[PDB]
Design a protein around this ligand. Structure first.
Ligand SMILES: C[S@@+](CC[C@H](N)C(=O)[O-])C[C@H]1O[C@@H](n2cnc3c(N)ncnc32)[C@H](O)[C@@H]1O
Ligand SMILES: Cn1c(=O)c2ncn([C@@H]3CN(C(=O)CCN)C[C@H]3O)c2n(C)c1=O
Ligand SMILES: [Cl-]
Ligand code: NA
Ligand code: NA
Ligand SMILES: [Zn+2]
Ligand SMILES: [Zn+2]
Lengths: 115, 300
């Protein structure tokens, strides 16, 4: 029944004022892309930065197993668009937020399916 | 005008000299480029390298196979691999490797000395940023280095598809004479210096379109001396200008043709096509790799 909870541990570390994980790999791009959350190539728009996915995944960066039962990673081998206002903590961002399964934007940072 | 390029390539006339090796003395040694906000040196470096490779006649087949040695950083991540994956067509098989553990966007990653790395298949593009900082010793003579350079020369001769290309990082002290000699086995070659790292004796030795046999005979001791002569007499202005224009960055998926072929079948018309970036010669089977593990029981 025991299972380390890294997601929760990082959330609590951040709350307590800890420094966010650094050395997330930021890409050069046009910043005129689709704005979708997770893509096969950088797609940042004017309000986002694009990052190499593995470097923004808590589980990849901490050398722990991924939540998925098959262990698959959502971010590894792809690019994750992070709002520029949040790009000081890409790992925090991808953990806390979720991607609309319909339009592919971040729920709350581009997804207008709810309007 | 070179400040708007991604970097500067060795001019052909310097390649044709017969200089003696001198110490490398760069005017702007210690200076650094101003990078865009939050961009790492190694992302910028690899971006300019790929920007320069976009100007060459690279073969870009469907189901391209690329391997990247020296891909880990002291950060535990793989900035260069991320640029390569952005540059290469979607779906390109990308394998990377380094001596120490790191997390990467490559499709498969092998940890260990490069000599432990084995692959069944041939590759269309080989990138190496392998480098040992201890080779830099200004108080001792600067001789051709072996180590991973010996592995790289073997890997190229045995596992690079005809028509494929390489880019291998060297410096004033990190270099190998046979690697330069092997540049003469490509249809064209150069030493390319990124504008962001122009204050360093680093360069990427690039071989464009592998032919499997010498097109020209190169003395590698002499050619490294020629390289240092060029660097010593041609200051390069640090510049990050090319990083701000990524509209044309992606490698064009040329759909280059792949053929299996045997040594007797490589005629001059084939060699013509290889030289123009129009043909890749290798099997198209499954890509399988492995790394040797040394087994030891230290108990007693
Ligand atoms: C200049 S750093 C690489 C930085 C990395 N390319 C990046 O994108 O940020 C040189 C790397 O080469 C590796 N290296 C040196 N000698 C090696 C060897 N014999 N086999 C495998 N890797 C080696 C080191 O572990 C080191 O990470
Ligand atoms: C790899 N590498 C270089 O490329 C380089 N280029 C210039 N320099 C310095 C400047 N120097 C002078 O001004 C000498 C006056 N007697 C000589 C060097 O100290 C360099 N150094 C130290 C280095 O290690
Ligand atoms: Cl020569
Ligand atoms: Na190629
Ligand atoms: Na050096
Ligand atoms: Zn992950
Ligand atoms: Zn939506």
């Amino acid at each position: 029944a025991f299972a380390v909870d890294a997601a929760k541990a990082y959330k609590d570390y951040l709350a307590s004022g800890g420094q966010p994980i650094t050395n997330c790999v930021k890409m050069l791009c046009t910043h005129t892309g689709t704005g979708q959350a997770i893509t096969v190539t950088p797609e940042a728009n004017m309000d986002q930065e694009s990052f190499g996915g593995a470097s923004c995944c808590l589980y990849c960066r901490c050398h722990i197993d991924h939540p998925n039962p098959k262990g698959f990673c959502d971010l590894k081998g792809k690019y994750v668009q992070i709002p520029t206002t949040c790009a000081n903590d890409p790992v925090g961002f991808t953990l806390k937020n979720t991607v609309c399964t319909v339009c592919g934007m971040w729920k709350g940072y581009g997804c207008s399916c709810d309007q | 005008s070179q400040a708007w390029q991604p970097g500067v390539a060795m001019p052909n006339l310097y390649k044709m000299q017969r200089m003696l090796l001198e110490k490398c003395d760069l005017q702007n040694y210690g200076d650094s480029a101003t990078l865009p906000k939050g961009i790492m040196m190694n992302v910028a470096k690899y971006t300019q390298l790929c920007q320069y490779l976009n100007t060459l006649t690279l073969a870009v087949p469907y189901n391209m196979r690329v391997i990247h040695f020296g891909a880990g950083s002291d950060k535990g991540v793989a900035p260069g691999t991320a640029v390569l994956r952005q540059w290469l067509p979607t779906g390109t098989l990308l394998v990377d490797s380094d001596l120490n553990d790191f997390v990467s966007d490559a499709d498969s990653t092998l940890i260990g000395d490069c000599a432990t790395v084995h692959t069944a298949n041939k590759w269309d593009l080989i990138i190496s940023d392998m480098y040992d900082p201890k080779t830099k010793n200004v108080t001792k003579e600067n001789d051709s280095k072996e180590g991973f350079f010996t592995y790289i020369c073997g890997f190229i001769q045995q596992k690079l598809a005809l028509g494929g290309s390489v880019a291998i990082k060297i410096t004033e002290h990190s270099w190998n004479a046979d690697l330069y000699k092997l540049m003469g086995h490509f249809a064209w070659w150069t030493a390319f210096v990124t504008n962001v790292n122009a204050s360093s004796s680093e360069a990427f030795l690039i071989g464009c379109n592998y032919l499997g046999k010498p097109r020209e005979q190169i003395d590698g001791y002499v050619m490294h001396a020629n390289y240092i002569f060029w660097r010593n007499t041609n200051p390069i202005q640090l510049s990050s200008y090319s990083l701000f224009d990524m509209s044309k960055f992606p490698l064009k998926l040329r759909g280059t043709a792949v053929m299996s072929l045997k040594e007797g079948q490589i005629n001059d018309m084939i060699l013509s096509l290889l030289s123009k970036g129009r043909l890749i010669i290798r099997e198209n089977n499954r890509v399988v790799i492995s790394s040797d593990v040394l087994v030891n029981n230290e108990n007693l």
